[PDB]
Design an enzyme around this catalytic site. Sequence first.
Site, PDB file in Angstrom:
ATOM      1  N   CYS A 141       1.002  -1.153   0.150  1.00 51.51           N
ATOM      2  CA  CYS A 141       0.216   0.065   0.264  1.00 51.51           C
ATOM      3  C   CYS A 141       0.695   0.896  -0.187  1.00 51.51           C
ATOM      4  O   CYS A 141       1.614   1.442   0.807  1.00 51.51           O
ATOM      5  CB  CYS A 141      -0.543   0.082   0.796  1.00 51.51           C
ATOM      6  SG  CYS A 141      -1.865  -1.112   1.334  1.00 51.51           S
ATOM      7  N   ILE A 142       0.002   2.235  -0.605  1.00 51.62           N
ATOM      8  CA  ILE A 142       1.005   3.396  -0.382  1.00 51.62           C
ATOM      9  C   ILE A 142      -0.264   5.104  -0.816  1.00 51.62           C
ATOM     10  O   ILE A 142      -0.496   4.314  -1.369  1.00 51.62           O
ATOM     11  CB  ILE A 142       2.066   3.385  -2.530  1.00 51.62           C
ATOM     12  CG1 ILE A 142       2.814   4.890  -1.984  1.00 51.62           C
ATOM     13  CG2 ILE A 142       1.182   3.329  -3.303  1.00 51.62           C
ATOM     14  CD1 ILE A 142       3.814   5.148  -2.758  1.00 51.62           C
ATOM     15  N   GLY A 154       3.656  11.578  -3.593  1.00 53.10           N
ATOM     16  CA  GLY A 154       3.708  10.301  -4.142  1.00 53.10           C
ATOM     17  C   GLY A 154       4.874   9.526  -4.849  1.00 53.10           C
ATOM     18  O   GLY A 154       5.560   9.169  -4.997  1.00 53.10           O
ATOM     19  N   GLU A 175       1.585  -3.946  -5.781  1.00 51.36           N
ATOM     20  CA  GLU A 175      -0.021  -4.362  -5.390  1.00 51.36           C
ATOM     21  C   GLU A 175      -0.779  -3.622  -6.178  1.00 51.36           C
ATOM     22  O   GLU A 175      -1.376  -2.297  -5.979  1.00 51.36           O
ATOM     23  CB  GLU A 175      -0.019  -5.186  -4.011  1.00 51.36           C
ATOM     24  CG  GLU A 175      -0.935  -6.296  -3.468  1.00 51.36           C
ATOM     25  CD  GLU A 175      -1.547  -6.674  -2.449  1.00 51.36           C
ATOM     26  OE1 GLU A 175      -0.110  -6.289  -1.435  1.00 51.36           O
ATOM     27  OE2 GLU A 175      -2.172  -6.333  -1.906  1.00 51.36           O
ATOM     28  N   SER A 179      -4.826   3.202  -6.400  1.00 51.89           N
ATOM     29  CA  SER A 179      -6.142   4.800  -6.230  1.00 51.89           C
ATOM     30  C   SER A 179      -5.992   5.287  -7.634  1.00 51.89           C
ATOM     31  O   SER A 179      -4.868   5.213  -8.610  1.00 51.89           O
ATOM     32  CB  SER A 179      -5.588   6.001  -4.801  1.00 51.89           C
ATOM     33  OG  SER A 179      -4.091   6.293  -5.165  1.00 51.89           O
ATOM     34  N   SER A 188       3.407   9.325 -13.995  1.00 55.72           N
ATOM     35  CA  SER A 188       4.594  10.176 -14.700  1.00 55.72           C
ATOM     36  C   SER A 188       5.784   9.946 -14.136  1.00 55.72           C
ATOM     37  O   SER A 188       6.491  10.241 -14.762  1.00 55.72           O
ATOM     38  CB  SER A 188       3.287  10.892 -14.193  1.00 55.72           C
ATOM     39  OG  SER A 188       4.476  12.169 -13.384  1.00 55.72           O
TER      40      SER A 188
END
Length: 274
Positions: A141-142, A154, A175, A179, A188
């Site tokens: 998760c990030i 980010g 994974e 979002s 990007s």
Amino acid sequence: VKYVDKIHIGNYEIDAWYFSPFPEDYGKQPKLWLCEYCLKYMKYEKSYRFHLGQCQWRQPPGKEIYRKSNISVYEVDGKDHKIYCQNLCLLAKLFLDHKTLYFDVEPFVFYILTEVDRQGAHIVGYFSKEKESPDGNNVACILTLPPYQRRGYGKFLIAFSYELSKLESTVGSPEKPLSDLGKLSYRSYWSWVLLEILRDFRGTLSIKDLSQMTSITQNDIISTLQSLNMVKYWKGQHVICVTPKLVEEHLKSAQYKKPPITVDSVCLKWAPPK
Ligand SMILES: [Zn+2]
């Protein structure tokens, strides 16, 4: 039945985006108050104010593995700092729809991005990572906290995850699902990394070379090159386009330029576990 819908952390007040399974009694109040350092969640402004005056933590636990100017990253093993990592996962879940793990954190290591001043190291975001991933996931998760999103933080975390992967001599991929901001930020980041290379490299290189240079999977390099119109399929082979002028143009658009902060691998002090 009332969920936590608002938090206070450091100097920020932030509305929740999703259900997070804080104990039922914590959802009942108007607001949930979090120590910005140890991530302890509290029910009342009074207990929050008392805690701040008592708490000795001024940074995340675990090991500071990256430091450059006022930016630091801490590596926190879920096994060694269970409570912190649980607090972190419950926080993150307020803003991540698809995160399913909050309490069994032992199998994870967490990388906390912080901005640092005289007061301490303030949490901006993080990514979790499975200690053992046969599936090649270099991110579980990030997340960047809402007030920090879309400011380069980010993509910093994304960059950091690939720098770890490079040092591990392996390709990685986050994974799924990401979002919408996650998808956009990866695209990007890949674009920027690849354009930079294709600008510099004088010799010829294949997608295979690029993958080994960046730890980006061939699949992600290919889709990225396709959206940039920098690759063609010819006689059953993917062929990278040269066109150094287009590269320069791309590197100037807002969509793909060097982010405001970047990972300096020289400032990364980290060895993969054997
Ligand atoms: Zn605290």
